[PDB]
Design a binder for this molecule. Structure first.
Ligand SMILES: *[C@@H]1O[C@H](CO)[C@@H](O)[C@H](O)[C@H]1NC(C)=O
Ligand SMILES: *[C@@H]1O[C@H](CO)[C@@H](O)[C@H](O)[C@H]1NC(C)=O
Ligand SMILES: *[C@@H]1O[C@H](CO)[C@@H](O)[C@H](O)[C@H]1NC(C)=O
Ligand SMILES: *[C@@H]1O[C@H](CO)[C@@H](O)[C@H](O)[C@H]1NC(C)=O
Ligand SMILES: *[C@@H]1O[C@H](CO)[C@@H](O)[C@H](O)[C@H]1NC(C)=O
Ligand SMILES: *[C@@H]1O[C@H](CO)[C@@H](O)[C@H](O)[C@H]1NC(C)=O
Ligand SMILES: [Zn+2]
Lengths: 596, 209
């Protein structure tokens, strides 16, 4: 018989014999991420090794079947992924050190505690504390201490580990027909089989820069408006021509400018679009947040959350009795098990991210019908963009009024929309320069364009030029500040978040055409529209099977990321920002530093 | 003084309320005869997830007469209960248990989980993944013989010789699709020969001689 049919029965054996092995690893990994114990770290690692062993053996058997013979393209994708040699190309010397480093960096970031210089026994951890300091404090010194101490006491220790991480990871990617570890991540966006819908590793790197060029003007006026309004909040510390000190931004790294909304809110007297106060004053629970997000997906026709979701998920901090990984995580364990692990606090940020993570599950539930090796999103951005479609509709003041977090007699206004659009711009527009710089640094470091002696110089050289953020304190090469972020320290691709935002409005534009709309791209609550939901269901059901370019084309009408929908969503803000900067300087000077 | 019933109630509580069931590749068959069959007790159990009586009437099943009564029992995943149906193609139906396209009778299933997925499961059910041919209606194959993908020497478990049987792994955390479901199929049949079981009211219709 045909080898293609011979390989089909090989994959049929693989799919049926792999689910339990992957399920056991997922169960153990869930039991450690929800319960930090040395007993669970061994059990989770053992199940991962058995899962990895099953991958290694079934990969070698998959090498025998040649891809060039197979003509069923969906079969070709499944065989192609299983045939790939990942860490298997590494020797036992290389694989152990690569994994020993990777776990060590995660444990340093997780167990990172900064002691108060006075009373050294008092230590502040990044997750419970030292983020409240970096997101609620208006003291320049308190923010400076938390920003510098984390990037020095925790970051410096990650500097030696990251250098060996790059060289070992590069050897893995270079061995497996890639230029560098950046190319290994960059292949996620590649299509090479269908005419007109093909893609390449470098087409991402050129489209990102072309699309970012049209985001820079909007960022400049957002920067200037924030700069002026931060100048009042922190007098005598910010230059009206210079960059923005890093610790004065929203969070520990400047990734999100959301927390700056209090200082930069245009019209304070208009009712707050930040319903964080309203939730707490109405005794909103963690359950209500995930239940309200459930009703949103139900209204557009998508299914209820499974009973395994409500029974088995962890939606609150378990307490000081048992530790947990409180990074918002969506789990597709398999076997119909869908769970969300999150340290939900009653804030608007966790309300929107609950919609984001339930968007992950809705995507995960839809592609469950597809085979195991096709059980994934079209690309990384697609998965993260699906959740953001919901949080884009859920954040609208009309939807907030619908759920009761805004007054029943709320009257829309020109001023309120600027209040709403600015807050959405701090979260969405603000992070785009941060993501472009962070991945460009990592992409170039993997390529070797940035030498090890010029690592930190380039990190803050680009942060000033691209993002407009300056170092509050001079930093040597001993510091390793890029690894002070979770995503860099835990070996995750970060360009997914930049591509996410451009997809998000492209989908919403099409979803808000199916749901008969009247006005602009904002005020786009797809809630109660079954047509909008079924337009997404078809994309979610495909998974990795169809190419991402084709998947995008059927939904929105284009084979590539288009920055135009994003600019139309924020167009009322862009024009308002330009007038609000008539007497302010737009742009930043690359040579101003607070320490100078 | 006692009330004598020359035909006792048919053994229906035996098959349904049984402690253990069988894997689909080795489904169990039972004959019900020399008795009187009240199908009202089958309706009265609202816990039954699916009561799909193809052919004969659903609630007027009690008001009928029959000759050949066979009851088949097995347990399958919830998303595979659909494959236990007339003219449905799937791994269970094609290779484990196939109903006729002309089949008349009923298919009954319930949720299980409570017993056949106990914490630290004492049992283990199984299913057949590969076979050379699709099973004809009401056919069984308990073959442990290996399956070949190409022209293969299958004397050793090898790269292209795959063990025909595979195991169900039922856990509490599994979803409804991957949770166990207990299925009992009643194969009612009509023969021109004298009948064997009719029903409670119809004790003299055709069941007796
Ligand atoms: C945490 O894990 C330990 C062993 O890994 C276990 O004995 C304990 O019950 C777990 N705690 C909770 C709350 O599940
Ligand atoms: C590829 O094989 C699967 C096997 O089930 C089949 O269903 C599918 O239709 C095939 N691809 C195409 C394009 O027909
Ligand atoms: C995996 O490694 C083997 C040798 O160990 C090699 O023959 C094969 O081509 C490799 N596969 C890929 C996809 O690079
Ligand atoms: C979703 O769950 C709620 C609460 O259990 C229920 O009232 C509602 O009918 C369910 N909707 C669907 C479509 O199952
Ligand atoms: C959706 O419809 C329900 C039923 O009328 C309504 O109560 C709810 O407010 C609607 N949602 C929105 C966002 O208007
Ligand atoms: C099974 O047992 C329960 C409890 O004894 C009983 O109520 C039920 O009628 C029985 N079902 C059958 C079909 O015998
Ligand atoms: Zn996410």
């Amino acid at each position: 018989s045909t080898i293609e049919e011979q390989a089909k029965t090989f994959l049929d054996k693989f799919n049926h014999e792999a689910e339990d092995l992957f399920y056991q690893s997922s169960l153990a990994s869930w039991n450690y991420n929800t319960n930090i114990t040395e007993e669970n770290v061994q059990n989770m690692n053992n199940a991962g090794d058995k899962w990895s062993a099953f991958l290694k053996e079934q990969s070698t058997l998959a090498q025998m079947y040649p891809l060039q013979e197979i003509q069923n393209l969906t079969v070709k994708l499944q065989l192609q992924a299983l045939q790939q040699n990942g860490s298997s190309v590494l020797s036992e010397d290389k694989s152990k050190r690569l994994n020993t480093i990777l776990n060590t960096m995660s444990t340093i970031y997780s167990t990172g505690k900064v002691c108060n210089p006075d009373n050294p026994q008092e230590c502040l951890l990044l997750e419970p504390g030292l983020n409240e300091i970096m997101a609620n404090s208006l003291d320049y010194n308190e923010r400076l201490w938390a920003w510098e101490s984390w990037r020095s006491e925790v970051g410096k220790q990650l500097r030696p580990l990251y250098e060996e991480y790059v060289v070992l990871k590069n050897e893995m990617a270079r061995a497996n027909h890639y230029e560098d570890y950046g190319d290994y991540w960059r292949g996620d966006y590649e299509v090479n089989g269908v005419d007109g819908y093909d893609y390449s590793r470098g087409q991402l790197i050129e489209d990102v820069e072309h699309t970012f060029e049209e985001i820079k003007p909007l960022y400049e006026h957002l920067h200037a408006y924030v700069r002026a309004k931060l100048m009042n909040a922190y007098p005598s510390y910010i230059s009206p021509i210079g960059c923005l000190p890093a610790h004065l931004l929203g969070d520990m790294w400047g990734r999100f400018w959301t927390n700056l909304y209090s200082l930069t809110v245009p019209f304070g007297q208009k009712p707050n679009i930040d319903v964080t106060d309203a939730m707490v004053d109405q005794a909103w629970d963690a359950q209500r947040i995930f239940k309200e997000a459930e009703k949103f997906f139900v209204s557009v026709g998508l299914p209820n959350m499974t009973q395994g979701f409500w029974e088995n998920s962890m939606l609150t901090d378990p307490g000081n009795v048992q530790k947990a990984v409180c990074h918002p995580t969506a789990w597709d364990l398999g076997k119909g098990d869908f769970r969300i692990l999150m340290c939900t606090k009653v804030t608007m940020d966790d309300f929107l991210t609950a919609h984001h993570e339930m968007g992950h599950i809705q995507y995960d539930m839809a592609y469950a019908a597809q085979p195991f090796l096709l059980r994934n999103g079209a690309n990384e951005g697609f998965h993260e963009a699906v959740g953001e479609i919901m949080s884009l509709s859920a954040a609208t003041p009309k939807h907030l009024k619908s759920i009761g977090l805004l007054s029943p007699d709320f009257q829309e206004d020109n001023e309120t929309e600027i209040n709403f659009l600015l807050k959405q711009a701090l979260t969405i527009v603000g992070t785009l320069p941060f993501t472009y710089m962070l991945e460009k640094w990592r992409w170039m470091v993997f390529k070797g364009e940035i030498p090890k002696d010029q690592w930190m110089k380039k990190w803050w050289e680009m942060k000033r030029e691209i993002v407009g953020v300056v170092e509050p304190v001079p930093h040597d090469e001993t510091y390793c500040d890029p690894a002070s972020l979770f995503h860099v320290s835990n070996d995750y691709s970060f360009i997914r978040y930049y591509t996410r935002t451009l997809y998000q409005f492209q989908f919403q534009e099409a979803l808000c055409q199916a749901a008969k709309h009247e006005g602009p791209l904002h005020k786009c609550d797809i809630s109660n529209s079954t047509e909008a939901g079924q337009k997404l269901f078809n994309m979610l059901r495909l998974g990795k099977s169809e190419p991402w370019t084709l998947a995008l084309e059927n939904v929105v009408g284009a084979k590539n990321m288009n920055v135009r929908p994003l600019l139309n969503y924020f167009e009322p803000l862009f024009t308002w920002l330009k007038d609000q900067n008539k007497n302010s300087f737009v742009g930043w000077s690359t040579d101003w530093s607070p320490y100078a | 003084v006692r009330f004598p019933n020359i035909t006792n109630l048919c053994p229906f509580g035996e098959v349904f309320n049984a402690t253990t069931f069988a894997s689909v590749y080795a489904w169990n068959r039972r004959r019900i005869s020399n008795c009187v069959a009240d199908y009202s007790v089958l309706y009265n159990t609202t816990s039954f997830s699916t009561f799909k009586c193809y052919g004969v009437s659903p609630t007027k099943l009690n008001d009928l007469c029959f000759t050949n009564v066979y009851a088949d029992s097995f347990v399958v995943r919830g998303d595979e209960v659909r494959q236990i149906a007339p003219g449905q193609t799937g791994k269970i139906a094609d290779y484990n248990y196939k109903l006729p396209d002309d089949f008349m009778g009923c298919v009954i299933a319930w949720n299980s989980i409570s017993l056949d997925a106990k914490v630290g499961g004492n049992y283990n059910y199984y299913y057949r993944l590969f076979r050379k041919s699709v099973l004809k209606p009401f056919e069984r194959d308990i073959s442990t013989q290996l399956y070949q993908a190409g022209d293969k020497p299958c004397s050793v478990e090898g790269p292209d010789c795959y063990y025909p049987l595979q195991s169900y792994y039922f856990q509490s955390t599994n979803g409804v699709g991957y949770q166990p479901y207990r299925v009992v199929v009643l194969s009612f049949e009509l023969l021109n020969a004298p009948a064997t079981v009719c029903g409670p009211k119809k004790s003299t219709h055709l069941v007796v001689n």
